[PDB]
Amino acid sequence: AGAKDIRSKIASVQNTQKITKAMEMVAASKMRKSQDRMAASRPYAETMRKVIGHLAHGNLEYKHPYLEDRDVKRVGYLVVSTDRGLAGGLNINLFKKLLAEMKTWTDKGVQADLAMIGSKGVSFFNSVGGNVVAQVTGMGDNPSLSELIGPVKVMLQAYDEGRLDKLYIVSNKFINTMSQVPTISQLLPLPASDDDDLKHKSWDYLYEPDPKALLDTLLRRYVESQVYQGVVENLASEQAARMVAMKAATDNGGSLIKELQLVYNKARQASITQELTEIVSGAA
């Protein structure tokens, strides 16, 4: 033991607990901003996916590489992550689940191409040994699709030059203010829908310009919108996880204070007793 050093540790832990409380404040405010931005993003992606859903079952159809169900030789993943710590184990769980599915493809002899949106993902997968083909880091407090387009542009080129056959996006769903889950979702080759063809409503704009080029542009927009909503939702999840972790750290700091103080009190009492015993005995 020792009185001054224990009291120094008590002061330091007190200060750290106060700081963790403040960091919880910051995390909560950032979550508010992130969730309202998510609310803005939701309708646009929702409507666009409804569009492509009805295109999944239309008549007077024609082929498109992003539409057909081609075989899988290699798989692409668009991975979102934080660039910061103190967010609990969100990134770890998402990385583990992606590693599980990538292992499943590796069993089948199917290779994985990875594009990272965060620094933690870059570090984790370059040190573990995943083939990072694209990467962007440090997006900022307000993220924008403009900077994220580049990695998506690379992945799109990988698909449209024929090398990449199936493409997935991985992100954490903002299920609630206090609950989230990591997910892997089918992105580029169009997923299934429940419908039959709607024969007619208004005018078939299709052949006013070229159908192929316009459909190309539309599916570009579709993939970009999906990616943007995923990123925004993951930032909301990040703020939630950080606030939970900060609360836990605050409680643990209080727990250490209430015990270091017992050690300090016993130390003070014992020291005073020893010194007084020396004085009284030395009187002789």
Binding site: T177, L262, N265, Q269, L276, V280
Partner: protein, 230 residues
């Protein structure tokens, strides 16, 4: 005064000073010190003081004793010895006083070991348990409301918060000395009256009154009068 058959109140301005003066006298007499430097007869002197404050077949002496804990150490021999004799603990709070609630007694830290169903009565005991738990739950929801906001709460959660506010305000009381400080005439609430009031607030009656109806209003039957005017 006890032998006259009365129930007397004995106020001790500080018992810690009695203990410390005992230490000083023992040091002057030259006797060897114990523990953290206290007198060898600390427990005996404390017992001699405390054992005389009891109820006799006629008359009684109840005592309120101001307690200071050295170095905020609840294991220090003077606090540890003193607590062995206390039957109840009343804590006064600057935070409660800042809200304007008087007397500024914190209900969560104050305790009494008379508060058992077979000692005070089952109804009174369960009422006290309900009040204490409700105020504790409000103390947690207050942190949550500060951090996130009131939009997160459910209707049950909101109702608990409202009833807790009403209870907190019903704890206040106008004193006769508080006439000069506030103008309120001052009142004396019986045990059954306060039990009935807090039972009523807990079980949902007077949920339709405003929370300011309970502030410094005395008994619940006067809270309804204040709400009638309000």
């Amino acid at each position: 005064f006890r032998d006259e058959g009365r129930d007397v109140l004995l106020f001790v301005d500080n018992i810690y000073r009695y203990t410390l003066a005992g230490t000083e006298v023992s040091a002057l007499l030259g006797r060897m010190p114990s523990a953290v430097g206290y007198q060898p007869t600390l427990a005996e002197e404390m017992g001699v003081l405390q054992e005389r404050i009891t109820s006799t077949k006629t008359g009684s002496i109840t005592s309120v004793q101001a307690v200071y804990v050295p170095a905020d150490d609840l294991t220090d021999p003077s606090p540890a010895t003193t607590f062995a004799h206390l039957d109840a603990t009343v804590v006064l709070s600057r935070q409660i006083a800042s809200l304007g609630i008087y007397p500024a007694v914190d209900p969560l830290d104050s305790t009494s070991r008379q508060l058992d169903p077979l000692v005070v009565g089952q109804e009174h005991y369960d009422t006290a348990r309900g009040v204490q738990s409700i105020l504790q739950r409000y103390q947690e929801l207050k942190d949550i409301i500060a951090i996130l906001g009131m939009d997160e709460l459910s209707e049950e959660d909101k109702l608990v918060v409202a009833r807790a506010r009403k209870i907190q305000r019903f704890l206040s009381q106008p004193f006769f000395v508080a006439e000069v400080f506030t103008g309120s005439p001052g009142k004396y609430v019986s045990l059954k009256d306060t039990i009935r009031g807090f039972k009523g607030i807990m079980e949902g009656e007077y949920d339709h009154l405003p929370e300011q109806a309970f502030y410094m209003v005395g008994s619940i039957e006067e809270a309804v009068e204040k709400a009638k005017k309000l």
